Write a protein that binds this DNA or RNA. Structure first.
Lengths: 66, 65, 63, 53
DNA sequence: GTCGCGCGCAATAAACC
DNA sequence: ACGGTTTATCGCGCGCG
């Protein structure tokens, strides 16, 4: 499952403290938004990503938790 | 191309019986995003008829004149 | 519940059996149509409003 | 008429036997009534429910 | 076994003013 | 040398086995 590696790679190259939407990830990475959101919610559960509230939700690399 | 594939499948089901987009996405091997995108367009062109529900049911358009 | 009151008041200011569109509510309140529809459809599931399917949908006070 | 009976009577799973209703229809009225302010969802596995006074 | 989901929605077309 | 902006059931939050 190298879909996790490319998303974390994309959020790293986006910049410091930068966030983006799941619809934007589906467009750039060329991956259906269905698989994207399934991985995004999974990476936030692993603690590697954090979800900013909003519609749609914004996603960035987690900074706070251990 | 994808539309007639959905239409052809709804023929071999017996007139009266319907199906869901989730059921179509598996049989035709197509993501449900494209399935629903074609289904809603076939009902707007009069080719199909939508029975709204949870989830909605789709069948051949029935004339009502 | 603040934008909900602005919409509910207007639908009450306007006729006691009348309806209106989200576009009409958008201009008469200086609020984008996206924010209006967010409140309109939310009020429908709460049973506060009644929606008439159409182009565009019509919204009126329910009981 | 489910919205009326769901108030007179926990988990949505537990409500499937007390009323003989599928869990899909119970969670429907639960999240709907919770958006009407009358319910409140607890963080359980499965989640827990209770009437909000 | 969390799940309530109805979703098609624009990497659009068409219509408006 | 050139039609920008809004609509559409357009509300969408959806990840669901």
């Amino acid at each position: 499952s190298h879909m996790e590696q490319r998303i974390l790679k994309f959020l790293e190259e986006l910049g410091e403290g930068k966030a983006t939407t799941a619809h934007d990830l589906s467009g750039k990475l060329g991956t259906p938004k269905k698989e994207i959101n399934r991985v995004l919610y999974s990476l936030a559960k692993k603690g590697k990503l954090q979800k900013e509230a909003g519609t749609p939700p914004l996603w960035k690399i987690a900074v706070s938790t251990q």
